[PDB]
Amino acid sequence: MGHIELASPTAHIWFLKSLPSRIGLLLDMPLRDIERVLYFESYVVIEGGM
Amino acid sequence: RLVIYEREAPEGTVKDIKEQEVYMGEIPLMTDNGTFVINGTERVIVSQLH
Amino acid sequence: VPLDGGRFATSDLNDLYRRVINRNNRLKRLLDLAAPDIIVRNEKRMLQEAVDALLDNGRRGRAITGSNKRPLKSLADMIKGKQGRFRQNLLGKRVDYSGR
Amino acid sequence: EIGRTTDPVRMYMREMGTVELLTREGEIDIAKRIEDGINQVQCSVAEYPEAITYLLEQYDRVEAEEARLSDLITGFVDPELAREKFAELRAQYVVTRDTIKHATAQEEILKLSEVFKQFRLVPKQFDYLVNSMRVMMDRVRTQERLIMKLCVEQCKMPKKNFITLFTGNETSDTWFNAAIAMNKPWSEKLHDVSEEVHRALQKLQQIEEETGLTIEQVKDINRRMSIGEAKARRAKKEMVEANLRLVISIAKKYTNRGLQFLDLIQEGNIGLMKAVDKFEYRRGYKFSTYATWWIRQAITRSIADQARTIRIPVHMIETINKLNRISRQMLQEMGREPTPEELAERMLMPEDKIRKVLKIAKEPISMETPIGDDEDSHLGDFIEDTTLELPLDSATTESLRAATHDVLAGLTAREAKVLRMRFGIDMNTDYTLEEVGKQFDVTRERIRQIEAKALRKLRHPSRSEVLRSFL
Amino acid sequence: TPEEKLLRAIFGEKASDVKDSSLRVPNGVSGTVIDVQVFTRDGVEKDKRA
Amino acid sequence: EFDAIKIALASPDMIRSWSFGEVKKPETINYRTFKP
C-alpha cells in the first residue's frame, strides 16, 4: 500500500454520517451543528477559557 | 438561410441574405420489413406503452 | 489492464484517488500562494468532498458520476450488497472441476 | 440560508455573491494601493547593505560570465549601458564604504538608495533579498524571546522593569550589569543566569557585526516591511474577491471536458490571482481585458493535465484538438466522415503521424460497466489474469528438474559440476568459462572442451529419450 | 529456466521469436467452410487470397 | 496460524507504517510506452 499526506484534516464519513454519529455523540454535539462547522459556515470555540 | 437585419428597425428590411444547404447528421432508414441495420445487425425498435 | 484493440479498462478507484490527489495538490499550491481565505476554504470543502466520495460515494450529498453518467463505485460499495466481497466472493465462489 | 443544502458549489456561490463589482476607477485605486505597498517593500529592502553586496556579487558573476543580466534585472528605468551603470553603482558603494566612518554615514543612506532603487529586479531573486531580512528578523527575535524567559519569569522580575530598562537601549548592560544594586529579589539572582544571558547578548551583538546596523534599525525597517507586505496583500484580496464572477463566466464554458465545475473555477482562481500581480493600470486598459487571458490560460492548461487517467502532454493535446476541428470542418464540406489520407494533405503532416494521433487510447472503460441485458454482469467479470502460469506448464517444470537430475547423475562428478555451473542448475547465478576456471584451476579453453564432451555424451540415445519429450 | 537452456544447449534447437496465435475451430463443432471474407486497411498490401 | 481477527481504528502512524511510499502525483502510466 501507499499513502496520501492530506494538506488538511478530513473527517471520516463513516464515523460522522452514520445515524448514531459517533463524532456527534462523543462530543454531545448535534450532527446538524457539526456539518455547519465542517462546511466552513460557522465557528466553534475550542477551550476559549471561562 | 442566414439573414442579417438593419439597425434601428423592429422588423425592417434585411441587408444581406445567404441561403446555403448544411449537412446535419445521418438518420437510419427502415427496410421493407420494419427492421433497422445499425452495425451490420438487424434491430427492432419495440413500441412503448406509457 | 489493456483490452485487445489499444483501449484500456480501469477501476473507479483510480478516478476517485486521482480526484483526491489533484485537490490535495491544489490545496498545497494555494497555501503556498497565500491565497485569500475564501479560495482556500472552497478548496478545503472540495478536498473534504473528494475524500468523502472515495470512502463512501453518495452518502453525503450527491453521488459523483463518471463518463458513463453512472455513480462510480467507491471503497464502501465494494464490500456491501449482494455483489460485495462478502456475499459474491467469500460466501460463494466459482469452482473448478465442474460443469453443466 | 445556513444551513439548508449540501451542494458545495451552491455554498461557494452564496459566499462569493456578497462582494460587489469594481467600477473603472476602483480598479485604478486598488492598483495604486498595490503599487504603494510594493514601493514601501522595495524602499525597506533598499535600506540594507546585504542586498547591495549580493547584487555586487551577482554582477561579479556576470563579469566572469557565471550568470546572465536577464537573470538579475527585468529591464531598467543595453548590456554596455547595464555594465556602466553597474560600474557607477560600484563606485557609489565604495565611496559609501569609505565615508561610512556616523555623521557622514547618515547622508550616505540617502545617496546609496538613489542608485539601488533605479534597478528593476526579478521576482525570483527579489524574494531572496526579502528572505535575507526575514531570516535576519527570525534570529534577532529568537534571542529576544530568551531574554524574557531568563530574566522576567525565572527571577520574578517585573514586566514593567523589562520595559523601563531593556526596552529603549537593547545594546547596553544597564539591565544586566548595572541592575544588580537595585535592591530587588531578581538583582541578586541574575548571577546564576548571567553566564548564558550575556553570551545570548553576544550572539545578539554578533548580529550588530553581521550587517553593520543597530538592533533598532533591524526592527525600525522590518515594521515598515511588515506594513508594506500587509497593505499590498489586503488590496490584492479586494481585487480578487471583486472579480470572482469573471472566473465563473469563463469556467462555465469548459464544463464537460473531464473536470468538475468546481475544479475549473478553482484553477481559474489561481489564474485570476496571477493577473492581479501583473496588471498595469498605466496602460489605461480594463482589468477584464487582461485578466481574461490569464483565467482562460489556467483553465485550459488544467484540462490538458487533469482530465485523463493516462495523461498525454499539452503538445499532443493541441494536436488532437486541431485534428478534431479540421476533421469536422471537412464533415460539412464533403458530406461524410473523412479518411486519414485526406487529413494528411489537409493538416500538412504524414499519414503515419496522423495514424498515431488517432490511435491514442481514449478514456478507459470502467470495469463496472454493465455488459449484458441485465444489471448482473459487468465488464470486470470477463477480464482474466494473464500473468499466471498454467499448472500443466507448472507441473512440466517440476518434471524437467527431475529429468535433468537423473541425467546429470549419470555423468562424471567433474562434468556434473561444470554443467551445474555453466547453467545455473539448483543454485544461484550461472558462470562463464573463465569463472569456473578458477574453481577447478583448469584453463578456460579446456573447460569449454570438458563441457563440450559432457554435452556430447547427453546427445547419445539411451540417455536422451525422455528429454526429447520436453520439446 | 536453467533446465530449459540446458535442454536447448543439448538439442541445439533455438527458440522462435514469434508466437502462434492462429484462429482455430472451437472444440466440439465440426462444419464445412462455406465463405471467407477478407477486409484490409487501405495502407496494407493484399495477400494472394484477398 | 492465527486464532482471532481484531478490528480497530488506525492511527496516522499505523497508516504510515503500512505504506511503502507516498503517492504524490495523479499520473498512472505513460501514454507512449505504457510503463508505470
Chains D and F form CB pairs within 8 A to the count of 15
Residue range D6-65+78-306 in CATH 1.10.601.10: yes
Residue owning grid cell 473507479: C12
Cβ(D6)–Cβ(A40) below 8 Å: no
- Beta-carbon separation of A4 and F16 below 8 A: no
- The CATH number for D307-387, chosen from 1.10.10.10, 2.40.40.20, 1.10.3720.10, 3.40.109.10, is 1.10.10.10
CB-CB neighbors (< 8 A) of A6 in chain F: none
Do A and F touch, 3+ Cβ pairs within 8 Å? The answer is yes
Q: Which residues of D104-126 are buried (b: 16+ CB within 10 A; e: fewer)?
A: eeeebeeebeebbeebebeeebb
Using the Cα atoms of residue D204, residue D209, residue D214 and residue D216 in order, give the sign of their dihedral: negative
Chains that touch C (3 or more CB pairs under 8 A): A, D, F
In the Cβ-directed half-sphere of A4, how many Cα atoms lie within 13 Å?
23
Torsion from C-alpha of D327, D329, D331, D332, nearest 10 degrees: 180
* D437 upstream amide cis, omega within 30 of 0: no
φ and ψ at residue D109, rounded to 5 degrees: -70, -45
- CB atoms < 10 A from the CB of D178, how many? 11
- Beta-carbon separation of E5 and D468 below 8 A: no
- CB atoms < 10 A from the CB of E2, how many? 18
| Interface check C26 vs A, CB under 8 A | no
Q: Cα dist. D249→D243, D254, D255, D268, D415 in Å?
A: 10, 10, 11, 10, 83
Residue D465 labeled ligand binder: yes
CA-wise closest residue to D41 among D243, D235, D258:
D235
- Chosen for mutation from F7, F22, F28 (greatest number of chain A CBs closer than 10 Å) is F22
**Per-residue H/E/C for D297-331:** HHHHHHHHHHCCCCCCCHHHHHHHHHHHHHHHHCH
Cα C60-C72-A18 angle, rounded to 5 deg: 25
Cβ(C53)–Cβ(C64) below 8 Å: yes
Residue owning grid cell 504524490: F24
Mapped onto helix, strand or coil, the DSSP state of residue B19 is coil
Experimental structure resolution, Å: 2.9
CB-CB: which of D240, D266, D359 is closest to C26? D266
Q: Are strands C9-10 and D365-366 parallel, antiparallel or unpaired?
A: parallel
Report residue D78 as a C-alpha cell: 543595453
Chains D and E form CB pairs within 8 A to the count of 38
Report residue D256 as a C-alpha cell: 464537460
- The Cα D378–Cα C68 span in angstroms is 13
Same fold, D307-387 and D388-469: yes
Residue D143 CB contacts under 8 Å (≥ 6 apart), including other chains: D200, D201, D203, D204, D207
Residue D63 CB contacts under 8 Å (≥ 6 apart), including other chains: none
Cα–chain-centroid distance for residue D240?
24
Q: Cα dist. D295→D33, D123, D276, D373 in Å?
A: 23, 21, 11, 46
- Chosen for mutation from E4, E10, E16 (greatest number of chain D CBs closer than 10 Å) is E10
How is chain D split into domains, by residue range? 6-65+78-306, 307-387, 388-469
Method: cryo-EM
Cβ(D227)–Cβ(D40) below 8 Å: yes
Residue D11 CB contacts under 8 Å (≥ 6 apart), including other chains: A39, A41, C45, D5
- The Cα C19–Cα D258 span in angstroms is 11
3-state helix, strand, coil in chain A (%, to 5): 35, 0, 65
CA-wise closest residue to D2 among A21, C41, A33:
A33
Considering the domain D388-469 in this protein, what is its CATH number?
Answer: 1.10.10.10
Where does residue A25 rank: exposed (0-12), middle (13-18), buried (19+ CB within 10 A)? Answer: exposed
